[PDB]
Design a binder for this molecule. Structure first.
Ligand code: F43
Ligand code: TP7
Ligand code: TP7
Ligand code: COM
Ligand code: CL
Ligand code: CL
Ligand code: MG
Ligand code: MG
Ligand code: MG
Ligand code: MG
Ligand code: MG
Ligand code: MG
Ligand code: MG
Ligand code: MG
Ligand code: MG
Ligand code: MG
Ligand code: MG
Ligand code: MG
Ligand code: MG
Ligand code: NA
Ligand code: NA
Ligand code: NA
Ligand code: NA
Ligand code: NA
Ligand code: NA
Ligand code: NA
Lengths: 247, 442, 548, 442
């Protein structure tokens, strides 16, 4: 697959996020328990709640599509569908809203992805969500200063940074320590205080943010200068326009 | 035939049925099984005799939580269902042994009614079905128990509800797949105002059958609306064939190849490869490490892309066994395929746009609901001209129980009655058989 | 020198607008705001009076971790907190809607033919003036024929009246001028000539029913109320039997054959009668706005006054209350009429067009769309990138999408003189913006945006329509914020650049050229400011009939 | 053989055509000419090519007084009408041998269009007629002149108006006898939403043909609504026969006997005498110098009384050559006959009630209008189940020019196109002939 046109670093980064053969750079290690804590859907050690019986216990209709499409493990078990939601600063966060949804539907099975300006969400069966969430938090999808895990009160993608280079958070879920240079998650994604905070690593430096970002800006790489990417968007506009008129 | 195209027809198990059938053998205008399905849905009514009985015995008539103290009537309707149904059939039929059907179900608790075709041949629309059925049953119940002039108005309220004070049959104990003509978003929309859950109920959650029924209804409405006339007719017919009827086994084969481990993205890659292999698209221009594809047949590209869209829904929502992400598949299949190819997505962006609003109105406070409550007449999902709703039906058929407003919740009476009709339950079978029968008349 | 939005950004923040960092969390939350403090205090008072908790700052999340900003009303020097621009809190905005809702236009042409042909009686400027005296007594709710009638209190219904207009100057001059909308006074000479030629010898009434009635009732009341009192006044003034067969002809004329509603009725899912916001086509909204007759040497000002009119009505009142409600959609709309932001972007585009093509001189084709809409989109997006205060101001992607595309689409229409290529430019802007920032609006913002390019030039049943004829009930447009008022502006744009007197209906244009309206349609943004300052005096209040 | 009744059928000159016709041979469910008329009304559209051309040249599109400066397009549509109409027909038709009709009128200024029946056989309702016709003509105009993509939307607005922003085709330059399905007062009402002026236009002011067309439409609607099912079927059939089809020459003979000098009251006296002579009524009781009449056949009494009502209208409004008094005749015929006999009036008081409201709403400030703007779907005149509106059509046929909102004013396009269709113009002839042809199949 070729994914996306363009000859900038932004364009190549957009292609790399979508390409399942591109190995996402892992930047930090997070424990399984700490992912569960950040998610906030169940306590560590708590059994997964169910919304319906295991598929093996139900009489499914005779259906070639069911036979050919392997359910994800959390579907087999009857897990709830739960979410993880991220906000990405327009000041050079590595991932950005449509990049995430495009990449999620290339990389992950059984995924409900939603894109908005200030928030981007994936919903899937709980156990599978945990595994995806680990990758979303450990890799270059996430910077702890320029990205935030937020299930509500998402404001900040478009705001000025604070003095430490941290994005605004109305609920201050991610705290930078000036003495240590590291960020800790002190609340889960919906804003309830954690027992014990989760280390999220150091923020990426400016040069690394610029290498990794998928937003076009005048002070990085401008979209208007990525003429091959612009050309394709204009092509799509023209072809859609002509098609609606006559085919 | 107006068009040169031929398609190979397959069944819901991916087996070849008939080779090289003219495309127009699948047209709503020509295919006798599509005609039977449409005329059948116009004329079929589900009657809830148990519901009528309970309404009367409690005086709970005329809408949610309504009751008229002192008006109770203790009538053994279900115990006398055979007599009442026979009496109603005498009034519903035009002549003896015509195509009127009245069939009891559930030990007399329900009845399937099919009002004779002759009534619709001299009608403007389809409301004769509920109205003729309702009055026949009202009259049959009054006559069975010799209900007095003073009390008979309660029987009317128990059957048809608060009509005509309400515009709708509010609180009625009869149901149809269609809804009243006043609720159309535009002229020509009646076959669109059929809930997704009703289609999934009638087809017993068989994914391919649900997708077929939905596509037949949607694309048939596109003829009634005038959308499939002139310049656009072939696009509509190719979409019916490839997205809804598994033409050339393309949907089925894309699911087969991507079902074990695939994603929306892997289905896109396979569809683009197949479109190239078949000569539907070709490289037009090379940019830097990027090929720009072109086509000399946009309607056929659209049909191939639409098959892929159905397959991507079946792979993504099938893997979850959860319907909600259909809104996301309908959006990102289209968004991703445009940037993959440089060609327009399904319905020239209108599926993508439908999916943006559908996503919003299935994940927000403002309206909408779960996938199953949508339909082609819904303001959220009317915009694509038949290429979005059939995927929603496939997704709902695949849901293993994640929805509150499921077909079990919204569509039980429809399920019990409408699933009895073979052409409603297994439309892919009958439409394919009819297309093969008429293939040399086209 | 400065971009037009710089003064507003300097008022909002301590930092220069270019600065990238700021301080949060130490502003006192809601306590930083005079208005939120007023609300906290009022909530305590309300809850105590009624015995039910109400407004409480401690419920949910704590507002005011960032600066709670003032907004400049564009083209004014008035700065207000955004709560003063909520329609509930702004009497000017409520009166603007009431003045539209309570208006209908009703011909006298059929009526005069009934009098002459069926009754055999004469119609002259003298009989018309007599009829107009009579209907100005009857229209507010007072009697002319029967004994023992009870009547509305004149002071409660002081805003209701009937005027007439006609293209025939000599006839207009013979009717008492108290009753006439004088086209030659209200419009500049070339516009007056166009409007008079459209009306010809037709004579049309502009009827305004009482605001108190419109508020008690609905918009579908307006043409009924109008017709009843027209009917009574025709009986009185022309000596009919008071109720003969001919009386029915006047009824059918006034209610059906020669009525112009402001809005048409809506389908069942959004059921509403006539004269509700969703029925008002974009071309009518542009014509209701009176900027065209006062600001005609500045097409940007005309177009953006139309956008202000429509963003408030369509997003705040219509989508934000009739179709939803609650806190609603104030700032989705204020983005289009505050801080001089849309103004900066649209002046840029107008200048680009003027210098490259000349207004109205570009080819009406896709090449022009691709050129102008792309250039203007890139300019607007660059401003959010160069001015971090601008980006924090218009913090929601939807707001930014609407503002940038409105400039792009209006500018394209300034170039081509055609609203349909302006609309194509709006959709192209969206696509470019989405790819540039990897985001656009809210979850459902681009439903119409993705259907948009294909539906601009479609001719299919529920797809094809000139933009002027579209409105909030065009299927793709029926649900979402950040489009409708901007489309009214794009409808206005080519007509403003051309110098046309109207966009879609000359009768509607003349009907709002009336100094006896309560709201001043020549200066919509000024009026919004007046209402924000609690300085606007609406009609329809009940003070006279309630205790002191 | 559901019913034993037979009637003698006459023409519009009072000559016997067929004796001893079983009543059910006139039923809408059985009579092939009623079927043809209803299917024809569903499928027929008038196209104003001159109007489309003038709307385009002036940019006056989208409703009253509307205009878009700068959008004018000067196209020689009327001058190229044959080519445009032929191109449209190719899109409208399903096959070359079907029942599509496209006929130019007025030197190309107008077209008669009958959309093929096969489209309606797979449609829910009737809106395919205007919508298929409109898009075929839009596309044919665009193709004739190679109208650009940039301008083609004006052609669409000139043909179909402000739709879909308006619910109706506001400003359209096409017309049908039927109106959009959203405007139905109730399900089943579509054949009632046909303006009286349109019926009088189509029948060229022939009084008995206007009465017949109106009765056929109204009584056929009564079947669609379920009103003519079970207990009330015979009453509706007898009313169709005696009121609208001049059965037994009763209407005609009452008119002949009362036309020179008669009044409503003299018609009543003759009808009561005739009902007594025929054994439909008999004296039940004697009061003080006053005979109370009874009957063993209320449906037949109602049919006799309805024939009298029609004849009273023709005598009273015919003598004035002025239609307004039909509201008065419909009221006082019924009021007077109840006090003359002691029996209920036509439709058991529902004609009288309709007439009270119709009189008010044709002589007051509040709504309504002249007789010609009413119809069976109008809120004022919906109440009688087929027994009032045919009299209004007779009265407007007899009007010599007293009305402002005449058929010339409201229905000129309908007049030019729909009067060309023989079965719309002279329906009595065709229904009588079809009844005779099927008499032995009953
Ligand atoms: C709960 C939802 C989902 C839903 O259906 N509607 C919400 C909430 C709703 C509520 C919020 C009121 C409150 O806080 O109680 C109201 C005011 C509608 C109402 N019920 O009156 C609203 N949104 Ni929302 N909503 C808005 C917006 C937005 C932007 C905010 C992005 C940001 O970075 O701050 C995002 C969508 C996006 O990302 O593009 C958004 C989301 C959301 N919007 C998320 C909550 C986001 C969060 O958790 O913080 N709105 C805007 O982008 C600007 C205008 C603004 C609206 C109020 C106004 O117009 O003044 C408001 C309009
Ligand atoms: C979708 C539909 O809601 P339902 O699905 O019918 O509940 C519709 N609401 C809306 O379109 C809401 C529009 C205003 C709020 C969202 C603005 S983006 C309505 O209430 O008629
Ligand atoms: C008949 C109808 O008017 P039209 O014939 O449609 O103009 C209808 N009015 C009314 O029913 C008026 C009722 C109130 C005044 C009379 C009270 S007796 C209405 O406006 O919709
Ligand atoms: O978050 S959502 O886009 O659903 C609503 C925005 S107000
Ligand atoms: Cl094609
Ligand atoms: Cl009988
Ligand atoms: Mg690990
Ligand atoms: Mg730890
Ligand atoms: Mg593959
Ligand atoms: Mg069976
Ligand atoms: Mg400073
Ligand atoms: Mg600083
Ligand atoms: Mg005169
Ligand atoms: Mg004055
Ligand atoms: Mg004076
Ligand atoms: Mg010529
Ligand atoms: Mg032929
Ligand atoms: Mg061309
Ligand atoms: Mg006599
Ligand atoms: Na049968
Ligand atoms: Na053959
Ligand atoms: Na400052
Ligand atoms: Na700078
Ligand atoms: Na709070
Ligand atoms: Na609704
Ligand atoms: Na007071």
């Amino acid at each position: 697959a070729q994914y996306y046109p363009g000859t900038t670093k932004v364009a190549q980064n957009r292609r790399n996020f979508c390409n399942p053969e591109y190995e996402l750079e892992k930047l930090r290690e997070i424990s399984d328990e700490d992912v569960v804590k950040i998610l906030g859907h169940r306590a560590p050690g708590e059994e997964y709640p169910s919304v319906h019986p295991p598929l093996e216990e139900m009489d499914e209709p005779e259906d070639a599509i069911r036979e050919m499409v392997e359910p994800i493990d959390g579907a087999k078990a009857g897990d709830r569908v739960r979410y993880i939601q991220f906000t990405d600063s327009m000041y050079f966060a590595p991932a950005q809203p449509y990049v995430r949804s495009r990449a999620y539907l290339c990389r992950y099975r059984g995924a409900d992805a939603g894109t908005l300006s200030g928030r981007q969400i994936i919903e899937t069966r709980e156990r599978d969500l945990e595994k995806i969430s680990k990758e979303l938090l450990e890799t270059e999808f996430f910077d702890p200063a320029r990205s935030g895990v937020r299930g509500k009160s998402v404001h900040g993608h478009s705001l000025r940074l604070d003095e430490d280079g941290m994005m605004f958070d109305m609920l201050r879920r991610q705290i930078y320590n000036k003495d240590t240079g590291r960020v800790e998650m002190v609340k889960n994604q919906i804003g309830d205080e954690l027992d014990e905070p989760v280390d999220l690593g150091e923020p990426l430096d400016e040069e690394t943010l610029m290498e990794k970002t998928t937003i076009y800006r005048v002070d990085g790489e401008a979209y208007r200068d990525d003429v091959e990417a612009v050309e394709i968007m204009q092509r799509i506009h023209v072809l859609r326009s002509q098609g609606g008129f006559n085919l | 035939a107006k068009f040169e195209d031929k398609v190979d027809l397959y069944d819901d198990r991916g087996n070849l049925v008939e080779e090289q059938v003219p495309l127009e053998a699948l047209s709503p205008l020509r295919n006798p099984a599509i005609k039977s399905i449409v005329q059948g849905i116009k004329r079929t009514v589900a009657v809830n005799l148990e519901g009528i009985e309970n309404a009367l015995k409690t005086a709970k008539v005329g809408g949610p939580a309504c009751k008229i103290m002192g008006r109770e009537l203790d009538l053994d309707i279900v115990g006398n269902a055979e007599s009442i149904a026979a009496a109603a059939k005498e009034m519903i039929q035009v002549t003896e042994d015509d195509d009127t059907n009245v069939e009891l179900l559930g030990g007399g608790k329900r009845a399937l009614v099919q009002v004779p075709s002759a009534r619709f041949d001299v009608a403007a629309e389809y409301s004769a079905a509920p109205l003729v059925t309702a009055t026949a049953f009202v009259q049959a119940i009054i006559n069975e128990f010799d209900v007095s002039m003073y009390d008979a108005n309660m029987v009317k309220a128990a059957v048809l509800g608060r009509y005509p004070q309400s515009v709708e049959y509010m609180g009625a104990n009869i149901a149809t797949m269609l809804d009243i003509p006043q609720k159309l978003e535009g002229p020509g929309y009646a076959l669109r105002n059929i809930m997704v859950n009703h289609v999934v109920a009638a087809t017993l959650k068989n994914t391919l059958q649900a997708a077929a029924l939905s596509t037949i209804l949607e694309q048939t409405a596109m003829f009634e609306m005038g959308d499939a006339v002139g310049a656009f007719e072939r696009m509509h017919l190719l979409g019916l064939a490839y997205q809804g009827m598994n033409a050339d086994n393309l949907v089925f084969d894309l699911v087969k190849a991507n079902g074990k481990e695939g994603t929306v993205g892997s289905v896109i890659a396979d569809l683009v490869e197949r479109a190239l292999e078949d000569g539907v698209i070709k490289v037009e221009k090379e940019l830097t490490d990027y090929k720009v594809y072109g086509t000399d047949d946009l309607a056929m590209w659209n049909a191939y892309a639409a098959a892929g869209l159905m397959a991507a829904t079946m792979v993504n929502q099938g893997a979850a066994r959860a319907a909600q992400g259909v809104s996301s598949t309908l959006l990102y299949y289209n968004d991703l395929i445009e940037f993959e190819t440089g060609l327009p997505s399904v319905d020239f962006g209108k599926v993508e746009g439908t999916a943006v609003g559908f996503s919003f109105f299935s994940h927000s406070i403002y309206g909408g609901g779960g996938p199953g409550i949508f339909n082609g007449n819904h303001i959220v999902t009317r915009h694509s001209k038949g290429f979005a709703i059939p995927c929603v039906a496939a997704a709902m058929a695949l849901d293993a129980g994640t929805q509150m407003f499921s077909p079990e919740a919204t569509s039980g009476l429809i399920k019990e009655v409408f699933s009895q009709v073979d052409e409603f339950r297994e439309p892919l079978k009958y439409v394919v058989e009819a297309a093969a029968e008429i293939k040399n008349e086209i | 020198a400065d971009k037009l939005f710089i003064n507003a950004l300097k008022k909002k923040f301590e930092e220069s607008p270019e600065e990238k960092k700021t301080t949060f969390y130490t502003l006192g939350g809601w306590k930083q705001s005079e208005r939120k403090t007023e609300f906290v205090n009022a909530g305590k008072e309300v809850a105590a009076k009624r015995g039910i908790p109400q407004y409480n700052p401690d419920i949910g999340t704590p507002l005011g971790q960032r600066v709670l900003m003032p907004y400049q009303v564009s083209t004014t020097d008035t700065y207000v907190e955004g709560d003063d621009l909520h329609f509930v809190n702004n009497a000017a905005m409520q009166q603007m809607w009431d003045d539209i809702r309570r208006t209908v236009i009703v011909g006298l042409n059929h009526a005069h033919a009934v009098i002459e042909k069926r009754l055999g009686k004469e119609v002259t400027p003298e009989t018309i003036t007599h009829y107009l005296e009579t209907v100005n007594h009857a229209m507010p709710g007072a009697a002319v024929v029967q004994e023992h009638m009870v009547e509305t209190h004149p002071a409660l219904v002081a805003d209701s009246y009937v005027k007439v207009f006609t293209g025939n100057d000599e006839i207009a001059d013979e009717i008492d001028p108290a009753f006439v909308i004088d086209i030659n006074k209200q419009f500049p000479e070339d516009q007056a000539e166009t409007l008079k030629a459209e009306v010809g010898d037709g004579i049309w009434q502009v009827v305004r029913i009482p605001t108190i009635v419109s508020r008690t009732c609905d918009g579908a009341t307006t043409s009924r109320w109008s017709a009843m009192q027209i009917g009574m006044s025709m009986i009185s003034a022309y000596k009919q039997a008071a109720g003969e067969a001919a009386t029915g002809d006047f009824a059918y004329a006034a209610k059906h054959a020669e009525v112009i509603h402001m809005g048409t009725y809506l389908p069942v899912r959004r059921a509403r009668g006539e004269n509700e916001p969703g029925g008002v086509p974009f071309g009518y909204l542009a014509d209701i706005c009176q900027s065209s007759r006062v600001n005609y040497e500045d097409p940007v000002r005309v177009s953006l006054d139309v956008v202000a009119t429509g963003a408030m009505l369509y997003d705040q009142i219509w989508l934000g209350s009739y179709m939803s409600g609650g806190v609603g959609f104030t700032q989705y709309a204020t983005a289009a009429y505050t801080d001089n932001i849309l103004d900066d972007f649209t002046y840029f585009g107008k200048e680009y067009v003027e210098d490259k093509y000349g207004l109205c001189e570009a080819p009406n084709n896709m090449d022009t769309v691709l050129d102008v809409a792309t250039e203007v989109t890139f300019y607007g997006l660059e401003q959010y990138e160069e001015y971090p205060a601008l980006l924090e101001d218009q913090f929601g992607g939807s707001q930014r999408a609407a503002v940038v595309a409105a400039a792009a689409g209006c500018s394209t229409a300034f170039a081509t003189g055609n609203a349909q290529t302006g609309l194509s430019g709006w959709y192209l802007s969206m696509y470019l913006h989405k790819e540039q920032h990897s985001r656009l609006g809210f979850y459902g913002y681009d439903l119409q945006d993705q259907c948009g390019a294909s539906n601009v030039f479609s001719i299919r049943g529920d797809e094809g329509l000139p933009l002027e004829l579209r409105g909030p009930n065009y299927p793709n447009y029926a649900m979402n914020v950040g489009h409708q008022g901007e489309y009214a502006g794009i409808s206005q744009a080519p007509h403003a650049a051309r110098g046309d007197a109207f966009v879609f209906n000359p009768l509607v244009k003349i009907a709002f050229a009336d100094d006896n309206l309560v709201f001043d349609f020549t200066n919509v943004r000024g009026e919004f400011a007046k209402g924000a300052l609690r300085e606007f005096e609406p009609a329809g209040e009940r003070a006279l009939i309630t205790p002191a």
